[PDB]
Amino acid sequence: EKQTVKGEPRFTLEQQEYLKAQIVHLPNQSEQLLQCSDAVLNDVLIGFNLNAER
Amino acid sequence: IKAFISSPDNRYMLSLLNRTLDTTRQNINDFIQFCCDKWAKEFNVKTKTFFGVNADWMRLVGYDEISKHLNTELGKVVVFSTYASMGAGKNPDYAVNLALEGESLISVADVTYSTQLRSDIDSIYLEKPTQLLLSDDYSHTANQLCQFHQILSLQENGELSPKSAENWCRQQLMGMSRERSLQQYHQTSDYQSAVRKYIEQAVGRAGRTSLKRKQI
DNA sequence: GTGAGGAGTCCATG
Numbered sequence: 001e002k003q004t005v006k007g008e009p010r011f012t013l014e015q016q017e018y019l020k021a022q023i024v025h026l027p028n029q030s031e032q033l034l035q036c037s038d039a040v041l042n043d044v045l046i047g048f049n050l051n052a053e054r
Numbered sequence: 055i056k057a058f059i060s061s062p063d064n065r066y067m068l069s070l071l072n073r074t075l076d077t078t079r080q081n082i083n084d085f086i087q088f089c090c091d092k093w094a095k096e097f098n099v100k101t102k103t104f105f106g107v108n109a110d111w112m113r114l115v116g117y118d119e120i121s122k123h124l125n126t127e128l129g130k131v132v133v134f135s136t137y138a139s140m141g142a143g144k145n146p147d148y149a150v151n152l153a154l155e156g157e158s159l160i161s162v163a164d165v166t167y168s169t170q171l172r173s174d175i176d177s178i179y180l181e182k183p184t185q186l187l188l189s190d191d192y193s194h195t196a197n198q199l200c201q202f203h204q205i206l207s208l209q210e211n212g213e214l215s216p217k218s219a220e221n222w223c224r225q226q227l228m229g230m231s232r233e234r235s236l237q238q239y240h241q242t243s244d245y246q247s248a249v250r251k252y253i254e255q256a257v258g259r260a261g262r263t264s265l266k267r268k269q270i
Numbered sequence: 271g272t273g274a275g276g277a278g279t280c281c282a283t284g
């Protein structure tokens with residue numbers, strides 16, 4: 001986010017956004033499920049036709 | 055503790071130990087508190103002692119209490135903890151208050167430093183560590199595998215003759231206690247290297263600022 | 271008595 005060369009910013013905003021979209025983070029299985037919200041799980045369940053199963 | 059309290063111009067002391075002094079040892083805690091109160095009365099100082107410094111206490115209350123009490127009211131702080139406790143919590147610093155401090159705040163950096171002013175520990179007590187032989191607490195076979203691996207590694211590197219290694223393995227197979235294992239381990243040259251490494255790691259982790267006192 | 275002398279943690283599976 002913050003970096004200067006000769007007192008001048010190095011990257012623009014779009015370049016910063018591209019750079020920040022290349023790093024992932026993998027926690028355990030328990031925390032990943034709790035990070036998801038209701039909408040994401042509902043959309044995934046509807047898309048794959050998993051809502052039928054009781 | 056008495057030697058530290060005898061020193062006039064000091065504020066901090068963190069005595070590393072190898073046991074946890076909590077309500078399970080409330081008697082010795084009260085004995086230490088009474089001695090500290092008497093020694094403080096002998097001089098003219100006010101000293102506050104912190105007990106039960108553990109990972110659970112750190113995650114429940116927080117380390118910022120010591121910093122808050124350090125830069126708000128004049129006094130001296132003594133903290134008790136173990137080696138393994140200071141393994142997950144880093145940066146044990148605190149904000150400064152030049153009004154309360156004296157004149158022994160000599161800067162160390164040869165160039166100007168930005169941001170706020172912070173200091174670190176100025177007195178540390180070290181103790182000889184205890185059991186340095188690894189063990190497992192998942193099942194009954196894993197611990198035995200670990201012990202056999204350690205014995206075979208020590209034999210392979212060259213710190214144990216075949217006779218000693220074979221006798222140790224035979225004794226461990228037919229039932230043995232921790233004391234015999236540690237006694238067998240203490241007669242090699244890896245123990246000294248392990249103790250030296252632990253002491254070096256402990257002394258290195260203390261000190262991250264440039265506001266050093268006249269005496270440490 | 272005879273050796274020595276204890277807290278701390280990551281993740282997967284019904």
